[PDB]
Amino acid sequence: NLKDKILGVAKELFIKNGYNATTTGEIVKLSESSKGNLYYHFKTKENLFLEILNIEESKWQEQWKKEQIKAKTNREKFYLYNELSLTTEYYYPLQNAIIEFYTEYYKTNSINEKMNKLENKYIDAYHVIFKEGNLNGEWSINDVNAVSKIAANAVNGIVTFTHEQNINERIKLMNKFSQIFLNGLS
Amino acid sequence: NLKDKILGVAKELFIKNGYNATTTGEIVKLSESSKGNLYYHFKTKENLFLEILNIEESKWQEQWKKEQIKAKTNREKFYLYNELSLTTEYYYPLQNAIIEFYTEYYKTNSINEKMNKLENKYIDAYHVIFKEGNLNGEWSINDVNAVSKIAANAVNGIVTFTHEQNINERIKLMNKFSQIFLNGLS
Numbered sequence A, B: 001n002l003k004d005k006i007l008g009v010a011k012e013l014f015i016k017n018g019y020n021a022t023t024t025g026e027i028v029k030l031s032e033s034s035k036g037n038l039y040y041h042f043k044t045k046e047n048l049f050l051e052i053l054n055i056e057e058s059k060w061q062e063q064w065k066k067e068q069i070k071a072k073t074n075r076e077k078f079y080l081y082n083e084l085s086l087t088t089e090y091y092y093p094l095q096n097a098i099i100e101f102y103t104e105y106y107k108t109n110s111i112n113e114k115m116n117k118l119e120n121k122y123i124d125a126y127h128v129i130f131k132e133g134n135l136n137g138e139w140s141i142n143d144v145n146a147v148s149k150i151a152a153n154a155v156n157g158i159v160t161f162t163h164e165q166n167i168n169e170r171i172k173l174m175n176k177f178s179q180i181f182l183n184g185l186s
């Protein structure tokens, strides 16, 4: 494909480099396509980027739904989601670029928007898990929205700022995290 | 001194223009030094920047030392340290140069080695708090190093990824997090 082949190349650079880093020049020279191409569906370069962010979040959320089945209690769904976060090839590998992207677009208002709409998906999984856990009586949270935001950010932190040491050590910490977090909910 | 003048000038340049655009040549002339002297003290821009980061960490340590007297118990020092981290990073001018530097060297090993000596210094704050907490029956944790790595990165995610919300909300969420987390340890 083409419209779907650019996405694929940019994704690679954005990760393999960063937002500021990788450039529309490089995107094109490693992919092969005129400039305008990136102008219809791809308004700006930050449009191509918010696009990739959309796919990835979709894909990771899809995979998680095709995987949460292995977890009976929501308590277990919480643990599972946090460990899978460490291994997916989706979304989380773009956190640095995103961090960077935000530190240079928070100055526009069209940014504090999309970058905040994508946040709804991001925290949704925890919302379902947490609200469902309330219905299922596993715990009793009155500020589900706050708790979901906190879990998602905390977890994205462990996933993102421990990205150097051994994966089993990480999975270990993440499980100890899920342990402590949930134990503090009640 | 000439060494400290290089550090001070570079720090300002990195803040005004960020990492990528700042050159050792700018640094040499503005501090009235030489490529040779700069080579002798730091070898490279990356190294120079890492040295700056260590000085910054010390300054941050010394500041924590004074501010933590506002907290009798370690339960308090925990709440206070997290809140501080969120508020001071909100207006820390080096954060962009730092974001630009990490997301651009978390691939190399030359650099990625030291970053961890540095990241470990930051995690120590938690280690001290938690150990002290044990010795005063505020809690009993048997995996101090571990809970410490977790608190550090979890807090870190909350500081880094919430960046699209009004400041009191973020402080509200950070404090809620400290409450939950400290609750799951008891």
Ligand SMILES: N=C(N)c1ccc(OCCCCCOc2ccc(C(=N)N)cc2)cc1
Residues within 6 Å of the ligand: B056, B057, B059, B060, B063, B081, B082, B085, B086, B088, B089, B092, B151, B152, B153, B154, B155, B156, B159
């Ligand atoms: N001249 C001075 N007085 C001075 C100079 C530099 C300084 O350095 C501030 C660094 C601020 C950014 C603080 O960033 C974090 C992020 C996360 C955690 C955490 N997760 N614990 C802790 C700190 C402090 C004081």
